[PDB]
Every structure is written in C-alpha cells, then in structure tokens.
Amino acid sequence: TRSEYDRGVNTFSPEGRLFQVEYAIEAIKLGSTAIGIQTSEGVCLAVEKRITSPLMEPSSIEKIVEIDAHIGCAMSGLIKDAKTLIDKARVETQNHWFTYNETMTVESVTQAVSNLALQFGEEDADPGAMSRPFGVALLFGGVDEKGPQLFHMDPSGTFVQCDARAIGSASEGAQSSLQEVYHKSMTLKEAIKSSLIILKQVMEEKLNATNIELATVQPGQNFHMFTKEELEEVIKDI
Amino acid sequence: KPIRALDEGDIALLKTYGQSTYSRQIKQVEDDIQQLLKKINELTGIKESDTGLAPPALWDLAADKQTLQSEQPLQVARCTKIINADSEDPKYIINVKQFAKFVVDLSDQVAPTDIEEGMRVGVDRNKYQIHIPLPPKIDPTVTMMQVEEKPDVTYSDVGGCKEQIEKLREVVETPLLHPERFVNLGIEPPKGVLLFGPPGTGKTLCARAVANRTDACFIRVIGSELVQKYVGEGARMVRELFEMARTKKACLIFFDEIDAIGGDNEVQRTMLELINQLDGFDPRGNIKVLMATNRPDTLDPALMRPGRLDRKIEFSLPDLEGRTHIFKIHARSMSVERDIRFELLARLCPNSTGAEIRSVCTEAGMFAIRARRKIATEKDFLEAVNKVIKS
Amino acid sequence: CGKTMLAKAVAHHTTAAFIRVVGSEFVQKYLGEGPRMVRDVFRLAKENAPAIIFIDEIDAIATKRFDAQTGADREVQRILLELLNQMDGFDQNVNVKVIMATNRADTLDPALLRPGRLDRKIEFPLPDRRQKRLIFSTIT
Amino acid sequence: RYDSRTTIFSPEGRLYQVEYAMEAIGHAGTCLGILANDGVLLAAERRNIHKLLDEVFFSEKIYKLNEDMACSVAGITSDANVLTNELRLIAQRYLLQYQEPIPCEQLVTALCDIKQAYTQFGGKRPFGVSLLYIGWDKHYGFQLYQSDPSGNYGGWKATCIGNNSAAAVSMLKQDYKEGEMTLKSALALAIKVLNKTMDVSKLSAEKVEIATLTRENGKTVIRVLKQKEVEQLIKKHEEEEAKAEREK
Amino acid sequence: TKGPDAASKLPLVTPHTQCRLKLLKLERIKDYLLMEEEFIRNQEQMKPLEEKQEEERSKVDDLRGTPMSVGTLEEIIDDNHAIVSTSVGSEHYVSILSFVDKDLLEPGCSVLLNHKVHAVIGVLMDDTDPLVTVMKVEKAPQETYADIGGLDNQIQEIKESVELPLTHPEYYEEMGIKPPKGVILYGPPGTGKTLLAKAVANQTSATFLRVVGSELIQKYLGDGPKLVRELFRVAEEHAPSIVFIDEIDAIGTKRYDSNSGGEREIQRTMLELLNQLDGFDSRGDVKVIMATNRIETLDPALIRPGRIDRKIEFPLPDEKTKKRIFQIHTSRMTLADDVTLDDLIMAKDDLSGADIKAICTEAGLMALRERRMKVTNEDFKKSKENVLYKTPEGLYL
Amino acid sequence: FEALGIAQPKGVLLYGPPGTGKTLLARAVAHHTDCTFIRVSGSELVQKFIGEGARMVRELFVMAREHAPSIIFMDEIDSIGSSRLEGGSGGDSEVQRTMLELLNQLDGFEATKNIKVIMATNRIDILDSALLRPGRIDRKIEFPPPNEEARLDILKIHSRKMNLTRGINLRKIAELMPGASGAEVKGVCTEAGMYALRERRVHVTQEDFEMAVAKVMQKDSEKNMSIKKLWK
Amino acid sequence: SYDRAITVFSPDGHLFQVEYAQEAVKKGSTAVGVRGRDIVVLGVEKKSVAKLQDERTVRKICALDDNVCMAFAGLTADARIVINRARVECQSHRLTVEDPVTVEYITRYIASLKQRYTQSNGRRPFGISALIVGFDFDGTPRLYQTDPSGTYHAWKANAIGRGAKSVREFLEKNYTDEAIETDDLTIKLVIKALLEVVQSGGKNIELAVMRRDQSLKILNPEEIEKYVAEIEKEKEENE
Ligand SMILES: Nc1ncnc2c1ncn2[C@@H]1O[C@H](COP(=O)(O)OP(=O)(O)OP(=O)(O)O)[C@@H](O)[C@H]1O
Ligand SMILES: Nc1ncnc2c1ncn2[C@@H]1O[C@H](COP(=O)(O)OP(=O)(O)OP(=O)(O)O)[C@@H](O)[C@H]1O
Ligand SMILES: Nc1ncnc2c1ncn2[C@@H]1O[C@H](COP(=O)(O)OP(=O)(O)O)[C@@H](O)[C@H]1O
Ligand SMILES: Nc1ncnc2c1ncn2[C@@H]1O[C@H](COP(=O)(O)OP(=O)(O)O)[C@@H](O)[C@H]1O
Ligand SMILES: [Mg+2]
Ligand SMILES: [Mg+2]
Ligand SMILES: [Mg+2]
C-alpha cells in the first residue's frame, strides 16, 4: 500500500524511498529531450522545441538560457519551475560577481542552484518557498578555470559532472546512444554533428530550423546560441 | 394563449389544400407495395427442412426394427461413491443429470473392476442397473485441450522478458535438458511454478515459446472451458491428459487463465486430482506443471505449498528496450518501410502492455489502408499510437 | 402513546376485513418480492369486503426517498413506490382504508403524506394532565 | 470528492464550495431594487417576524453605509454584519483619504476584492452573503449594483435576490420599461413583485422593508418608508389590484 | 455453409417531393411485386410433384414414428450408439439407426429422436429456437448513410471494421493485419449509435443479428449461455454475418464474485459470450458490434485488445455536425424562408442528434398549433426551450 | 405529421410535486381514448427470477403492438428506470437490465409504431439520462402546484357534489392556500365535509372551509427561532 | 487521491490541481487577440445582457497601462484581482525605473504572480488566462498569453476560452503576412475569427485597437455595425 506515502514529501517508504521526489524525477520525462556533450574545445547544448503551433513565436519557448556570458543552461520539466530556478541562478552569479568580483565556477553554480533546490522540506519556507520538490532537471555547461565543464542537475538537488548527459522524454535512449557515440577526443564540430544525429534519431519529427535550439560555449568566445543561419549551416551537413 | 384544438373541419382542411396533388396515389401505391410484400412473405412457403435422411440402399430397415424391438436405450449418469462395495455391496449412488440419484447394482455382463467412481455409465430403465461403463473419451476436436505438439513460436517471437525468460530457462531448461546436474547435486527439480502477471503481458506466449524450444508439446487448458459446460468429468479429462503426458515423452502442461479455476466442488475435485498428479505422480517427471494467472493470490493455499510449487514468476510490463523489441517482432509480419523509428514508438507508449502494442501495430496497418497505401509510414504508426495509447 | 393499541382496538371493533402487516415484513430477501407482497396485500384487501390494511412501523420502508446508490436502497424505495402506486395509483381502490403508524412522521416520504394517500395524519402526543388521569383510571 | 476546502478545483473546473455559497442565497430573504428615472429604492422581505420581535432597529435587511451609500443584505447574519462593517470602514477610509464620497463602483469593487480574497486563498469559508448596494454618484447619477458571494458584481436596473428570486426577476424583466419609471411607478412595481414572490395572499407592511434613495437640493437623502407611508403604499396597490380584477 | 440474409426492398427516395417521379418508381416497384405474386400464384396453381419414393419414405417414417423429439447430440460413441441430451437436459445412451447421415452427426447438431425408445432417427440443421430466429433481421431498417449527418470518422471506422473485410479484404492480408474482430460504439445517449447500427444493417451484405444484450439473459438455468451459443452458432452458420449487441452494459458490467445463483448465471452467460467471441477466428467473417452509453462500467476483459480492438467514440455533435443534422431532419419540412436555423446551432448546448430531431418535431407541432405548415423561425425559437428542459451565471465569464 | 415532414412524437413524461394531476391525467386519458390503454405502473416489472423483467417488458410491448395504437402508462417510472449504477456487488443490475430492455423497446433498432407511452414521477432529476433522452421521452410535461385560479377551479370541481350554502366564497378559500397542491385542495373539501358531518348536518359553511384549510395545510415549522434567524 | 492537492506530484508526474485550473479557462468565453504591423486587436465574445445588466461594468477587456492591454478568460473575480495587482505593479515599475513598462515585464510579473499563487496549499491558483498586448518603447508589436499554470508565451495571434481550438485552427489557416498589411486587414481577420465561434455577429463582440501609442479606444458600438457591414460586404464580395 504505497498510497499512504506518496501523499506528502516528508514521508518515508518501508523501503526508505522518497516517493514524492521519485514522482518529481519521473516528471522530467514529460519535458522535451535535451542533450549536452562535453569536449575539450567546449560544450554544446541541443534540445527539442516541440512547437505546438506554427503561429507560435519560437523565441518565447526557451529550452536553453544564459545564466552568465561564460555559462549555459538547458531545461526539462515545468516552465515556471525552471523560470524560478534560472532567475535564482542568475541572481546568484551576480551575487558572486559582487562579493568576489570574479566569474563563479559552474560546479558552484549547480551547488547554489541545488541549494535553492532540495529546500522543499525546509522550515525556512516560512516567508514562502517550495512546499513541493522542484520539478525540472537542469543541464549546466560552460567554461571555468578547469576548462570546459558540464554538470547535470537532478530535481532532488543531486549534481554530477557528465561528459555527455541527456534529459527529457528520451533520456534513456539518447543516453544509450551517447554511450557508444562519445569519445574523449571529440572535436566541437564533430561533437555537435553527433548531437544533432542523436536528436534526429530521437526526436519525434524531422529536424528543421524550428525543431532544434542549439548552443555552444567555448573558452574563446562567450555563450553563443546558434542563429537561424548558423543552425541552417550546422543542419545542412547532416 | 389558449391554443385551440384542431376541429374536424381543421383536420379536413389540413389533409387537403396544403397537399401535393400526388399524395393520394403515392400513399395508396406504397400501401399496396407493403401489402404485396406481406402476401409474398406469407405464401412463399418454408421449404422442407431436410431431416438427416441417408441416401437410399444404405438402410437396413429390417435390422432397424430388430434393434428398435430388442436393443434398449440406457440413461447415462455420473457415478459416485462405491459404498465400499467389496462384492457384497455392489450398489453405487449414481446421478442421472438433473434427474434424481439412485443406488443401483451392476449388470451380469459387467464386472466391478470395470466400474469406479466419477465415470459416465449407461444404466437401464427397468432396474437402473449399470449396463456398460462409458468413458468420456479424449479427442482434440472436443473440449479445448493442448491441441498443440510443437508450437510455432520460438524465443525470437518473445521480447522484452529477458530476465523473465531467463528465470523461465532456470525453471524448465535446466531440469529437462540437464537432469544430471540436479542428480549429482541431489536436489529435486522444481515441482511447480506460477507465472503471475497482468493480462496481455505475454505469460501465455512466453509459455508457448518455451514449450517450442524445450522440445516438449504445449498444453492449453482454458479455465472458463471447464468452468463452463465441460465441468464435472473434467477431473477424468485432465486425468487422461496427464496420462497421455506419461505416454508422451515430454509434455509442457500449462493451464491457460488459471484465474478461472484456482478461483469449488468439482473445482476442488480437479485440483486434488492434480494433487494426485503432482504429489502422487513422481516429482521427477518431464511433464512439469506451468501456472499462470491474472490474479496471483487467487490460487488455493494448498497448491503453492513447498513440494508442489517451487517457484513464482512475475511478468511485468515491458520496458523501453522491451517495447521496441515487441514492436519489431510485431512489425516483421507487416508491410512497412525499413526506416521506422521503433525506439520512438516504444518511447511514445509508456506502461503499455504487449496487447496494446500489437493493437497499435494493427491500427497502424488500418491507417495505412485508410489512405489506400500498400506500405505504412512512420506517420501512420504515430497516429495509431496517438489513437490506442492515451485511450 | 397508544398507536398500535388503537389499531388493535380498531381491529377488534370492526366488521371490516383486517390485514395486519409490519413495515419490516415487507422487505424481502429476493429482489422484487417486497413490491410483489405489497401488491398482494392490497389485491387481497381489494378482492375482499370493505377492508383495513394496518402497516405498523411504516418508517421501515416509507423513509423519504433519496438518491439510492445501492441495490438494497433501490429495492426499499421500490417497495415504497409500489406502496404509493397501490394506495393512490391508476386503478383506484374502493372501501380499502389503510392505517399506518410510525414514531418519526417527519422522515416519511412527502408523496406518502399527501391527501389522497394519508388523508389524516393523527398526532399521538404524550398524555397531558387530564389524559394522564384518564389513563391511570382505566389502567387501575 | 472535491467538496473539501474552497481552495480546490474540480476536474471540470468548478469551485464547488463557491457554488454552494451561491445556491445558499436561495435560503435568504427576498430583496430587490430597481432604477427609476429620478430615484432608486430597495425593497426587502422581513421573513422572520414571529410575534415578539421588538423591532428596535432602523432596518434589518437594508443597511446604510454612508451619506450616499446604502445596501440590502442576504446571507448569514454573522457574515452580513462583518460585510456591512467592512463596507463602512472602506467607504469612510476612502472619504478620509480623498475628501470625497466613495464612488459606488469603487466601493463595490473593494467589497468584491475582499470577498474574492476570502475564497481565493486561506482555507476560509467564503462570505455567503449577496448584497444589493444602492446609491448615487456624480459620475453616473443613480446606480444599483448586485453583489455576489462568489466575489462578482453587476450593474442592474432591476434585480431580486433571496428566496423565489428566479420567478421574481423573470416577471420583473417581463414588466420593466427602462428609462420611464418615476419613484411612484417603481414603488408600485416593487409592491407587485413582492405580491407575486412572497408566500402570502396579502402581504403585510410589517413583512416589507423599503428604503428609497433620492438626490434633491444638491444632497442625497436615504429614507426608509415609515409605517404610515408603507401602509398607504400597500393599500394603494391593494385597491389598484382590486381595480384591475374588477375591470377584468 | 449457406449464405447471408436480410433482404430489403429498394431505396427509392431518389425523389421525395411526390413529383410523380416517385410515382413512376413506386409504380415500377408495385408492378414487379404484382409480377412476383402472379408468378408464384400461377406456379402453385400448377405444380404437380409428389410421391416418387413413397414406400421407402413411408417405411422410414413408420420407423421414425410420431412424434419425433428433437435432441442435442452432446457426444458420439462408436458408430451405432451416441449420447444425446433431450431438451429437458437429461441425456441418454441411444442407438443411431442406419438411415441417418453419419457425416451430419456432429456435437451440437439437433438430432431427431424416437419418442419411445430414444434413438437417433434424423438430423436437424435448422433448429433455430424462436428467440434466436427473432433476433435475426428480415426487413432491413429504412435508414441509410444519407440519413446520418456528421459522424464521418465514425461511419468511416465502422465501415473499415464491418464492411471492408466482407467486401474486398485483400488489403488486410496484403498488409498482414488481421481484420478487426468486433467493434464497440460508445458515447452519450442519442448521439447516433443505434442509428449507425441501422445504417450498417441497411447497406450490408451479411446476416445482421440485432441483440438487446438484456435479451440474452434467461430465467431457466443454462438457458442464457445456451442462447448465446445458439446465436453465435447461427452467426457462423450464416456467415458472413454481423452480430449487433445493443446496450452491452446490460451484461458487460464489472465481473465480481457471484453469490446468488442468478448472479452466478449472469456471470456464466458473460463468460460464455466472451469464450464464444474468442472462439471464432478474426479471419472469420462474423463481426460483432456493441453499443453502450456507460463505457466506463464495462468489464475490462470484454474490451481487451485481443478481443474487441476498435472503440468508436460518439461525441456530442459539433456546430458543423449540428448543422448537417438540422439539414437532414428539416429536409422533409416545408420551412419558411425566414428561418435561419443558425441561432439554435449557435446556442452552446448539449443538443444531440435526437435532441435536434425532437426540436424539429416540436417546431412542426408548434406550426400546427398556429394552423400553418410553413414553420417559421419563431416556431423553432419556442420549440428549442420547449424541448430543452432544465455554472452559476458569472462564475466563468 | 406526414405532411409536415416531422417524426411522430412517441413518449411523454409527467413530472411534478407529489399530487398534482399526473396519475389523474393518465386516468382521464385512459377514460377518453379509443387506444388500448395499458397500466404497467412501475415495480411491476421487477421479478425475482433472473431475466424475467426484460422478458415481461418485451411481452408487454409485443402485446401493445399486436393491439391497436396503444398507450402505455408507466406510473412511478422512478422505480425501475432511475440510473444505471456502476459495477455490481451491492448495486442493482437486474432492474438495470429491465430498464435497458425498456429503453431499447422505446427507441432502439426496431422503432416501434403507434405505441405512445406516458410516464409519471415526482423526481425527474434522478431519472436515467438515457431514459429522459428526447426521442424516447419528448414533451417532458411539468405539473406545477396550481395557481390561485387553478385552485379555485379544483375547489369548484371537488365541491360539486357537496351541499354548499348560499354565501360561500370559494375564491377566498383558494386564496387561503398558497402553494397547495390539488390533492390538498380535494383534502380540504373532504375535511370541510367531515366538519359538517361531525355536527350531523348536511351544509358546509365558510368557517368549515377555513378550519379545513387550517387542518390540512398544518405543517411543522422551525420551532427554534435562533436557527430560523441564521439567514437574513 | 493525487488530484485534491495543489502541491503533490502524481505518480505520472502531474500537478493535477494546476491542470484543473487550466481547464477552468476552457469554460470561460472566447477571447482572441491579433498583433499587426502597427495595431493590436482584441476580439472577445460578449455575453448578451438579458434585460437589466449595465454593460459599462461587465468589462472583459481592460488596459493595464497606457502602453499595454489585456483580455481575460476565467472567473471574473480572479481577473479583477489580477488586473488590480498588475496595474499596481505597472505603476510601481514606473516608480522604480520611470520608463513605460514593456509588455515582457508586465507579462512576466503576471506569470510570476500566478505561479506564486499555485505553489502552496491554502492558495487556490488564479484560474484565468489573459492575453497581454501592447507596444514597447520602440513600438514593436508584441502579444503574450499567460496560463493559469504560471507560465507565459509569445503569440502572434491567440485565442482562449471556449472554442479556442477552433479559433486557433482558423488563425493557423488564415494568418498571413499580407493579412496584417493594413489595420483594416487585421480587423477583418479578427472579426472573422470571432464570428467563427460567435456566428450571430452584430452584438456579442467587443473590439479594441492599439496603434502606435494612441492610448487605445475600444471600438464603440457605432462602427462595430459599420465594421461588420464592411465584413459582410467583403464576405459577399469574395462570395
Ligand atoms: N448524426 C446524426 N444525424 C442524423 N440524425 C441523428 C444523428 N445522431 C442522432 N440522430 C437521431 O437521433 C435519433 C436517436 O438516436 P439513436 O437511436 O442512434 O441513439 P443512440 O445514440 O444510439 O443512443 P442510445 O443507444 O443511448 O439510446 C435517431 O433516430 C436519429 O434521427
Ligand atoms: N388539478 C387537479 N384538478 C382536480 N383534482 C385534482 C387535481 N390535482 C389533483 N387532484 C385530485 O387530487 C388527487 C391527486 O392524485 P393524483 O394521483 O392524480 O396525483 P399525482 O400528481 O399523480 O400524484 P403522485 O405523485 O402520487 O403520482 C386525486 O384524488 C385527484 O382527484
Ligand atoms: N514479450 C513479448 N514478446 C512478444 N510479444 C508479446 C510479448 N508480450 C506480449 N506480447 C503480445 O501480446 C499478445 C497477447 O499476449 P498473451 O500471451 O495473450 O497475454 P497473457 O500473458 O495475458 O496471456 C500476443 O499476440 C503477443 O504478440
Ligand atoms: N391511552 C392508554 N390507555 C391505557 N393504556 C395505554 C394507553 N396508551 C398506552 N398504553 C399502554 O402502552 C402500550 C401501548 O403501546 P403502543 O403505544 O401501542 O406502542 P407504539 O406507540 O410503539 O405503537 C399498551 O401496552 C398499554 O398498556
Ligand atoms: Mg407500536
Ligand atoms: Mg441509441
Ligand atoms: Mg401517481
């Protein structure tokens, strides 16, 4: 009889599981597929748009956003949940650029965001905060003093450094494909080609310019989201 | 406003004035049309029903009279307890269907060794003496039984049950095809296994596949079959099935939808007969029992006792790799393109039972037929899974 | 307060055809047997002389109708509806007066408490002063 | 089911507690008001006058709020009193802050916001009170607004709320000539509506509660019809009904 | 096996204005009806054909005797004796006489028995107890796919399920998919389920067996499953055939542990129906169609994908379907030119096909109330609320 | 109906408060009609034996068809056709089977002809939606409690046989009955007659009618004033 | 079960209270807004007042600031509350930054308000969807839809409320680049979309047009008859 423990996050299963947190985890699969890959030359983030109507403004739907010029993001889950998460992340990065006047590392970015996360069952919510686990899985990538770095965040608050992680509806299959398609010496161009290959194999529709949002972060330049022409260039090869 | 009832003049004027000039002949003609249909129906006749009369020169009408005047009919009955006969109480209580029950003594043409409880026996009218035992006979055309010696489904046609099929391998392949290992390990081979899981999971199909690959004939025992009309003598029916399994080199006895039997007077007689044919029958035999139900707990507690049912096996819903594998195995028999992203379909149908996936493939074929295309596209599969899945 | 006793006295002091039933007696095991018995008792009263049907504890079956969600409640309300249609239905009864007694009149169905079915709803209050004297005198 | 605290949403989207707060007004006393060419009035039913109520009051169903604001109440007595007191507080807070009598629409919206806040959040039962504010403002002259326990409102020239409100408002809209009634014809119409909607062959002036709002000489006067006045009006309507039936 | 049934007469309705084109067409129909009547009358007027065998037939009848009781051959023994159960239910070990066609004896076939000393003396292949005979459609309903407005997807699905396999089925095994054995119609009441069943039974080429669902239940023990078995045996015997079980929720409700004998018999009847539905191959040309309003209350084993794959949804008609239905049901009317009909369709309501038909009928009645038959727009305006009896205003605005 | 092009109406439901003229109207219709009127008042179709209710429904409709254009009066249709209950276990199903058979007979595959049917109930709101459906039940006639003129008419009908006195004003008596059903009006007539009988007279006076109105209409109010004053 | 709790994830990962509040909009009324080259239009179905309602106070279309407008679908009390809060926030934003509030800012504020109202128990979500329209400082036409889930999205022409799917498909089939060339073409499109669901025409439709900082005037019920005369004229013109 699980039913007595799913009601509420502050319950413990006979197997010691957090059923509310597990449901939040599974709620990630409701979101669109997001794939990020880490290479020596940088990190690239590929996502699916899942456009509901051609009359939609594609700029509104945001699967990848900028927390700071040196770092990038990817989302899978509730739009508003991730909106609060990203706003907090940007506020935190400016907090660091205020306190230490430096660019704060991506591992610390996911540290602070996970600090905002996993706070659902915390008494400090008296002013007002999450009474429910945050329902978005986060993909953080960028370049810091340790070179290019990509971190995947779990709505439970867990983070892990991942060379190539896939979140969203097709996380299992995309991860399985990335398992054999990834090599350590992969160049940025061939990595992005492989990422769009995985998206093509995974996405429910054909790949056009309005089906993919593409992002890149390299030590040289700042965060660049691929424009329409850059997206066409990177998709015409595939 | 007080609305006036239409007067007789008003009825008369409504019937005319605002009428087509052909109302009269049209209505009259249609009335005669219906009348003529009724006349044709009433006088067309019925035609002779053709009773079962054999072609001439086949009839022995003289000997027919001889039999009708000499040979006598016998009522048939479900014989019961022998009253502990010992040749001084040859009477048995016998049940003539919905008629009463009678204690009756044998005819001189029969011997008590040929009569035991539970069998159908022909009894005379005058004294109700059992005149001849009538075995219920065994025939694949009657009942619904094994009707299979080498099922056409192999391990290829079953997918998404890898741990499931591996446990089944442990259950059946190791004792049947490698008896020496349990001989020199001094361990009794598994005596009974229950394959419990939700409907449409593949229990029946996995059992049939393992039957094909175990070089043993598959047995199909539908429960509602012997809950319905073929009840009662079903004990002797399964008795004969098990006996032929003894004669057969190896049978894979699986009782389909045992939810219908495990959940009881003749039902209890039956499962105690299997008590005699697993407990009484040696546990070493090659006719191992296979149990599969939609309701696991429904099976009587005396059945799964240690020394009757060694294992219990859970058939869960197929996973992502399982769902894509069943999609492939079901679309192999279908006209589709060679670039169907089956992984996409498996992803799009979460927590979907195997029957739902086969119905999805069927609906994809239906959508392909709808557009009168000989080859189904990925689009057809997408709309089919939009239709079946999500209900 | 004297309800069943007044029914008893009426049964004694009558030339009429008295049929005594209790409410709980109507509710039968088998489906459709309760309404059948209501039909039978009223039919027996009709085919006899000027008759009296006394149904004690009518709140057993004549509780206010509601949205029955079970077979049993539906059957009880079916018994009540058969009672209504027998008392003041399509084919009327002649010289069949029905006496019905209950402890809780307010829980009775309003369709049963209308003139033409229960023309007179007679209240049997607790004795008042003089009534107490009369009861004491007639019992002592 | 979804009949728990008001902060719930039925799968079809209905707010069942708010729905019940709606239908609960059908148990309240019947009160109406209509908009005349040069006057506005509130007519209400005194449902509970058994024998021994002191009638130590100026009006029960009608509650005055301000030199320009008056309303009629229909709901639970406790929520009625709370709503009236909050109405007074908000109206006079606006007067103190702005040195102008509060516009009827603004005060109505203030009450509606409070009522919504009482069903929007907090796990508190919504005010089960439906109001009929009557008043004047220089922006739109004479205005009448019909409140709602749900927190909505509407500007109406004819509206009845309470028991038997549906039939009353249906016949009222059947017999409303907009823009061409004075105070006298409006009084006659209200009395006829009460005749048709109350459970009495001859309604007594005691059961009737009428207050009229009228602007004259640069000032708005709110007066409840005195017993002599209300009895004269009801007797006039009674002989008018007699005239109608004798002509019929 | 023999062939299908349900002969119907001609659609006519090529005109419908009684412009004498209807008259020539009905005149042709009636004239040919007269031709059939005269031909068969004159045939039976001169048709001398009898006797021939006689004495052999006479003596086989003498052996048969009178009466001969029909029984159900439950089981066969060595080919001189068999087991036959009389209609009472008691079964006897009897002898089979020489003149019976041993090929015809098959478990289930009705066998003629001698009244005294029971013995198989003939075989009846057309027992067809009156209940199942009544359940068979003889005069096809007059409705047609032209009479159905909207439901294009529903008509399309029902034709793909119970017309396409009976007509050219080469696509089905070309694609390797089995034809859909059984379809079920569901939706709110009065949406077009029974109407679609009538329409299918009209443009059909197979035996149509209409069933009430609650008709299958019988008082006597074992009569229910026996009736279901006989009904489906007739369906196979007259293949291809369509078995329409209206109001399937009369028996298709949730299966639960039976206690009373009647509940046990109902469960047994449903189990027999389900087993029979499994019994015939989907490649077989007998299809079942069941309709119900309370789809959720059905047994989730009656609607298993291996049993009843298709599930046709009948939503309340949309605005365009409403206007199609209104065009259909006002077609016969002599509508005045002022009627727009779009105001009623506009009104956001739950008007069904039946509701539209009733609105039209009430509008005609109201026109008759004013002694007219031209039916203005005002008649529809009042009829709408006359028929439509029975969200608190400003909640959701 | 054929010339208009409309379809013939089939059923009609008489719903309203308890005692208004529903069964009275059905009785009158039976009196004034040449059709073979049929009284099948509800719960007569509920048999102990399984599946017998549907069989009786079929037999009733086949008998109505075999006869002339007929009228079936299903009085208190609230009994058998109320609402299909989910599942079995404790919920009724046999009555649901009978009701479904009735529904199919009314408007199903066969499309019965000249079998106009009347049904009555006090609770229309609980009747099954598939039974209230137009085409099976059109013209859901409401029998509201009589208004003052209707109450006067009912009084003048039921006091027709009475020995009234000169000076009786039945209009005042009708006015003394706000929202009184017709059955209550007949009961008032009866009780005034009984008041005349008690004094062993034969005339009924106005005071007799006033006291009869007081006695019949007497009903228990809310005794507790405080509970009564919850609402304004 | 999992439905009667605003902040409890279902086993399949749904906040069912949020989706029920979202569905509550579908029981409102149709409100379609289109943005043109220089204009933005708001077409809403007006409830035909029976005999006595004052249409002055039945406001379905309201302007948050002189540079933004909005139409709502859902419960009117919630819409009034969010209107008051959002216009108060527009004024406070002008207090903080002195420049006119951009449509993005006010839409983000509305979405955040709805979201903070749907993340804790004891606070029922705002069951209203609002179409935000307006021009920025550089006069770019932007239109936003806010969803009771607390999210927002940029729509070129969207419809909400009952029948919003039909209007959505209509706009998909009819929204062209040349259909917004002139103000009259945008108007023709919006009235066509409106009459798709409210076929009665004439009344029961309200329109508002915002040009490049004209402080929009709702189209008054004199040229709605004129504009519908134009619509009917063009309608009999192509057919
Ligand atoms: N799409 C339609 N076009 C025309 N007429 C329709 C349509 N749908 C329904 N009708 C009308 O509705 C009437 C009753 O419908 P029908 O008998 O098919 O009901 P149903 O939906 O099967 O409901 P139920 O089985 O619950 O009684 C039909 O006689 C027909 O005239
Ligand atoms: N309008 C009326 N005119 C005359 N007599 C009436 C009227 N209404 C009711 N009655 C009388 O009152 C009684 C009402 O009984 P009736 O069975 O006709 O009522 P009903 O409305 O069918 O009630 P029920 O809900 O119990 O079926 C009858 O005896 C009848 O004579
Ligand atoms: N693991 C599987 N591999 C292949 N087919 C499967 C599998 N599971 C289910 N199916 C499909 O499901 C259908 C019915 O399965 P079945 O064995 O009847 O289910 P149950 O286990 O309830 O008896 C079969 O046609 C089969 O194709
Ligand atoms: N008026 C009375 N005179 C004498 N005895 C009475 C009177 N009323 C009640 N009783 C006593 O009370 C009992 C009456 O019970 P009764 O009122 O019939 O029960 P119920 O009210 O449950 O029908 C009798 O046994 C009788 O002894
Ligand atoms: Mg007693
Ligand atoms: Mg139907
Ligand atoms: Mg009655």
CATH architecture of chain G: 4-Layer Sandwich
Provide the CATH topology of chain D: Glutamine Phosphoribosylpyrophosphate, subunit 1, domain 1
Q: Walk across the major sheet of chain G and give the strand order.
A: 9-1-2-10-11
User: Order of strands in the sheet with the most strands of chain D?
Assistant: 8-1-2-9-10
Number of H/I helices of chain D: 6
Pattern of helices and strands of chain D: HEEEEHHEEEEHHEEH
Number of helices of chain G: 6
PDB class: motor protein, hydrolase/protein binding
Keywords: 26S Proteasome, Nub1, Fat10, motor protein, HYDROLASE-PROTEIN BINDING complex
Entry title: Nub1/Fat10-processing human 26S proteasome with Rpt2 at top of spiral staircase
Chain A: Proteasome subunit alpha type-5
Structure keywords:
part of a larger assembly; 7 chains; C: 140 residues; three-stranded parallel β-sheet; 3 strands; D: 248 residues; alpha+beta; Glutamine Phosphoribosylpyrophosphate, subunit 1, domain 1; five-stranded antiparallel β-sheet; 6 helices; 10 strands; 38% helix; binds adenosine-5'-diphosphate; motor protein, hydrolase/protein binding; 26S Proteasome; Nub1
Characterize the structure shown.
The structure is cut from a larger assembly and holds 7 protein chains of 7 kinds. Chain A contains 7 helices and 9 strands. Chain A is α+β, with helices and mostly antiparallel strands and 238 residues long. In chain A, strands 7-1-2-8-9 form a 5-stranded antiparallel sheet. Chain A is globular, with a radius of gyration of 18 Å. Chain A starts with a helix and ends with a helix. Chain B is of the alpha/beta class and 391 residues long. The longest helix of chain B has 21 residues, at 23-43. Chain B starts with 7 loop residues before the first helix and ends with a helix. The relative contact order of chain B is 0.08. Chain D is of the alpha+beta class and 248 residues long. Chain D is built from 6 helices and 10 strands. In chain D, helix 4 packs across helix 5 (183-197). Chains in contact: A-B, A-G, B-E, B-F, C-F, D-E, D-F, D-G, E-F, E-G. The interface between B and E is large, with 80 and 82 residues. Strand 7 (154-156) of chain D pairs antiparallel with strand 3 (53-54) of chain G, so a sheet runs across the interface. The PDB classes it as motor protein, hydrolase/protein binding.
Question: What's this, in brief?
Answer:
This is part of a larger assembly, with 7 protein chains of 7 kinds. Chain B is α/β, with parallel strands linked by helices and 391 residues long.
Task: Tell me the layout of helices and strands.
This is part of a larger assembly, with 7 protein chains of 7 kinds.
Chain A: H1 3-6, H2 19-26, E1 34-39, E2 42-48, E3 71-77, H3 79-99, H4 106-116, E4 136-144, E5 147-153, E6 159-161, E7 164-167, H5 171-181, H6 188-202, E8 212-217, E9 224-225, H7 228-237
Helix pairs in contact in A: 3-4, 5-6
Chain D: H1 16-24, E1 31-36, E2 39-45, E3 62-64, E4 69-72, H2 77-98, H3 104-120, E5 132-137, E6 141-146, E7 154-156, E8 158-161, H4 165-174, H5 183-197, E9 208-216, E10 219-224, H6 227-247
Antiparallel strand pairs in D: 1-2, 1-8, 2-9, 3-4, 4-5, 5-6, 6-7, 9-10
Helix pairs in contact in D: 4-5
Chain F: E1 11-15, H1 22-31, E2 36-39, H2 52-66, E3 70-74, H3 94-106, E4 117-121, H4 129-132, E5 140-142, H5 148-158, H6 170-175, H7 182-198, H8 206-217, H9 225-228
Parallel strand pairs in F: 1-4, 1-5, 2-3, 3-4
Helix pairs in contact in F: 2-3, 5-7, 7-8
The structure holds adenosine-5'-triphosphate (ATP) (2 copies), adenosine-5'-diphosphate (ADP) (2 copies) and magnesium ion (3 copies).
PDB class: motor protein, hydrolase/protein binding
Keywords: 26S Proteasome, Nub1, Fat10, motor protein, HYDROLASE-PROTEIN BINDING complex
Entry title: Nub1/Fat10-processing human 26S proteasome with Rpt2 at top of spiral staircase
